[PDB]
RNA sequence: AGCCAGGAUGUUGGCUUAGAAGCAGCCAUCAUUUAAAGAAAGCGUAAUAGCUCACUGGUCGAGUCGGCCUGCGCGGAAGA
RNA sequence: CGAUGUCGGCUCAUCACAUCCUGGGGCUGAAGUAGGUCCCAAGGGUAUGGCUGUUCGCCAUUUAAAGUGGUACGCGAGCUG
């Protein structure tokens, strides 16, 4: 609700393009439409992105505060990127880039390799760390854990990808 | 804003201080560290006692309601921290030039002289209030063509007290 | 099993003055820790299916590092209640277990004081006690501190100002034996401890401190 | 207040002081000198009451500084240096020793000044009041 | 983690949520608080 | 609701003790300042010192927080 | 009751899933080793001997596992007696 009824306001470098319920968002780097529109009329105008729950539909402003949300994140998005500092820690372990494909090192016989769908990238300030780059907000986190996902940080020691900085349980019980 | 009362007796605080008022000022805020006040609390603690006062809760919808000058040089109140401080007699502008001659930490600044209960000026600077409360620019300088008398110090300190 | 744990456990004249195990653990000068549980009371001959429903219960025995026993001391019973419990020992296993004797209840018989009594080097020792007085107890646990360890090596530790992590460590886990300032901060100090400890030490720190191993 | 690392006061009794206690990995948890500010504690033991117990402030520079900063000590043990007990109560208020006069406690906040946001002196010996109850020994004038 | 009939709540950081049909809950006190099914 | 900042002086309360002090305890836990801050709600330290709310100013601009009653629904709910 | 043959074994399977292993996960008093529970799982697979009519139970040695129970206490117009 709140949000939902918060206009958007579109910066003018930005270019917003409605089409149907769907919206291409041309920008800085970015150009894409993550949203797409069940229910809420949203629509441009000046810059004014209108919201509101159209027909009947209960998901009014929750859709609605969501499609906000999201092309607002969007826009934000054809701005710039998000989701960094993707650690790794311990002995032994280590990182590196090539191309798109991302090497990482966990004490498994086979080395350990994912690569990137575009729209991101990443750099090996060390091995020891992966930083990412992506034009919507979405995909770039998500699969940023998803290559946390290979190996949940260890409690015992804190072995393990460590999505961003994140505090971990860490317990120390039947030991030695 | 809070409880009644409380609202009211602060309210109460403010007019009855402005009665009191020797020489309002007014200092946006920040940091606002404890030693901000108990500075205050020294230079209006036992440093030279009484006479200047803090204060919180201020705005628009609170410091205007304090005085039948209202938010003339007192709109300025409001936004933001303000520790607004009025001084007290025996202090016609003792801590009024204090504030932006202490001034650093952003907080303790004259705001270049807010005074609203007799300056009645603002973004302009009034030091002249602090400049007065003298004697060595009287006695010395004009050879005493000031404290012999309004009559002479209109005839002196054009230059030096609007004046 | 009162006054040695500070606990609630209730006693009286009747049989069957305790049941169930009851965990408590208890201070020792050489592991600190150490977990007690008291036992039910014997009688002479009791029932053969009891105890094959009760090898539950007395599986912590078993397992027991020590075989701690009480005795009465008023009763001419003595000599039969031991060939009364051994009976039940036998059939229970773990009789192997080296066990400390507790002639409880001196209070009746003022038989001595109480005192260490080696049986040997050994140590299956006698015990003077008189529990709900409990006054035995120092040579209870003394006697005790003889008889479970495995590296009485001691040092005699120290540093220069980079002590209060040894004091740390000392009193983190067990004991300094002694603590003795010194000069500029050279500090000595001796400790006794487990080898176990010695090792997790001399690992986890520098222990270029080297008195320990 | 707060417990993880920052400046280091230092509780430290004037006199000799090298060990541990207080200024061992106390202060060379700082990797402070011992020597020098033990030595500029020592040349301002003159002037303190010499042995007496009191805080300091260390002031310190990228290279950790050797300076020390003078504290007034403590009101309560302003208090157990005057009834002269050696032990306090070990439930203090209900729990009590002796008494001690207010002069003491006046004498208290004209020294206490310097840590007081009394607006007020008798506010001030009143803090000292807060403490002084607070000891278990008895309050009079 | 449990499937206790009864649910209530184990920290003050827990938090009831509705996940599927499901009534999942959650802390961070620790996991083990994780009624669910209830 | 989130957000800007403050978080105070007695006083690391006395006792404990290597060390306890907002957080080994113990019992006291006040007095002060202020809109504001507990000798304390959580973390931390061997301990010391960080870290967050409780407290509040500011912010932002309409509603907001609950218990009670009550229809109809979910969870509990496995068989040859 | 103008008749429905009854225990154990022996050929033979059939399902359930209230899980014996293997399969997938939650927590752990989960160092790892391992477990314990819980959840999900029915695809398949899941001890010969001693003793006794035995089912059992006990015992010796195994295997990853020696799961439960239903099915005229599945199975005598198939035998066994």
Not at chain 1, 71 to 99: C, D, H, P, W
Not at chain 2, 109 to 131: N, V, Y
């Amino acid at each position: 609700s709140r949000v939902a009824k918060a206009p958007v306001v579109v910066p003018a470098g930005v270019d917003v393009k409605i089409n149907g319920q769907v919206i291409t968002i041309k920008g800085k780097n970015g150009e894409l439409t993550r949203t797409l529109n069940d229910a809420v009329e949203v629509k441009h105008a000046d810059n004014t992105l209108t919201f509101g729950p159209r027909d009947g539909y209960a998901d009014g402003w929750a859709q609605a505060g969501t499609a906000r949300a999201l092309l607002n994140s969007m826009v934000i998005g054809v701005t710039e990127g998000f989701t960094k500092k993707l650690q790794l820690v311990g002995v032994g372990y280590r990182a590196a880039v090539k191309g798109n494909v991302i090497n990482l090192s966990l004490g498994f016989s086979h080395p350990v390799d994912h690569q990137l769908p575009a729209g991101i990238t990443a750099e090996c300030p060390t091995q020891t760390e992966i930083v990412l780059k992506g034009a919507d907000k979405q995909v770039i986190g998500q699969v940023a854990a998803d290559l946390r996902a290979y190996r949940r940080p260890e409690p015992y020691k804190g072995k393990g990808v460590r999505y961003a900085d994140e505090v971990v349980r860490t317990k120390e019980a039947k030991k030695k | 804003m809070a409880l009644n009362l409380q609202d009211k007796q602060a309210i109460v605080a403010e007019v009855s201080e402005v009665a009191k008022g020797a020489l309002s000022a007014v200092v946006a805020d920040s940091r606002g560290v404890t030693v901000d006040k108990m500075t205050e609390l020294r230079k209006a603690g036992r440093e030279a006692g009484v006479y200047m006062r803090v204060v919180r809760n201020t705005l628009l919808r609170r410091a205007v309601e304090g005085t039948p000058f209202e938010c003339l040089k007192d709109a300025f109140v409001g936004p933001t921290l303000i520790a607004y401080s009025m001084e007290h007699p025996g202090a016609a502008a003792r801590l009024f030039k204090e504030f932006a001659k202490a001034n650093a930490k952003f907080e303790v600044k004259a705001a270049a002289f807010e005074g609203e209960l007799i300056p009645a000026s603002q973004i302009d600077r009034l030091a002249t209030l602090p400049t007065y409360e003298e004697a060595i620019a009287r006695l010395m300088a004009t050879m005493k063509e000031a404290s012999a008398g309004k009559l002479v110090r209109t005839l002196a300190a054009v230059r030096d007290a609007k004046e | 099993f009162n006054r040695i744990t500070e606990a609630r456990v209730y006693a009286a004249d009747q049989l069957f003055a305790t049941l169930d195990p009851t965990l408590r653990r208890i201070d020792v000068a050489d592991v600190g820790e150490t977990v007690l549980a008291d036992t039910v009371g014997f009688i002479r001959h009791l029932p053969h299916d009891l105890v094959a429903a009760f090898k539950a219960t007395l599986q912590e025995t078993r397992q027991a590092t020590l075989l701690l026993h009480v005795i009465d001391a008023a009763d001419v019973r003595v000599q039969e209640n031991i060939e009364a419990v051994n009976t039940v020992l036998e059939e229970i296993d773990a009789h192997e277990i080296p066990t400390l004797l507790v002639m409880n209840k001196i209070d009746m018989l003022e038989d001595f004081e109480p005192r260490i009594d080696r049986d040997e080097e050994n140590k299956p020792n006698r015990v003077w006690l008189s529990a709900q007085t409990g006054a035995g107890i120092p040579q209870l646990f003394q006697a005790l501190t003889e008889r479970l360890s495995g590296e009485v090596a001691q040092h005699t530790l120290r540093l220069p100002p980079q002590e209060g992590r040894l004091r740390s460590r000392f009193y983190q886990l067990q004991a300094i034996e002694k603590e003795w300032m010194e000069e500029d901060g050279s500090v000595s100090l001796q400790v006794r401890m487990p080898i176990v400890d010695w090792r997790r030490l001399c690992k986890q720190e520098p222990a270029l401190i080297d008195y320990l191993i | 207040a707060k417990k993880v690392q920052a400046y280091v006061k230092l509780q430290v009794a004037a006199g000799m002081a090298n060990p541990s206690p207080p200024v061992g990995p106390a202060l060379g948890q700082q990797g402070v000198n011992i020597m020098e500010f033990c030595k500029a504690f020592n040349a301002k033991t003159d002037s303190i009451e010499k042995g007496l117990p009191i805080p300091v402030v260390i002031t310190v520079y990228a290279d950790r500084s050797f300076t020390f900063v003078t504290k007034t000590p403590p009101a309560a043990v302003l208090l157990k240096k005057a009834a002269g007990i050696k032990s306090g109560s070990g439930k203090p208020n209900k729990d009590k020793v002796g008494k001690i006069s207010r002069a003491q406690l006046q004498e208290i906040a004209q020294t206490k000044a310097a840590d007081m946001t009394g607006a007020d002196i008798e506010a001030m010996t009143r803090s000292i009041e807060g403490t002084a109850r607070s000891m278990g020994l008895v309050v009079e004038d | 983690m449990k499937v206790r009939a009864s649910v209530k709540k184990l920290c003050r950081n827990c938090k009831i949520v509705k996940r599927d049909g499901v009534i999942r809950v959650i802390c961070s006190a620790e996991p083990k608080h994780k009624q669910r099914q209830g």
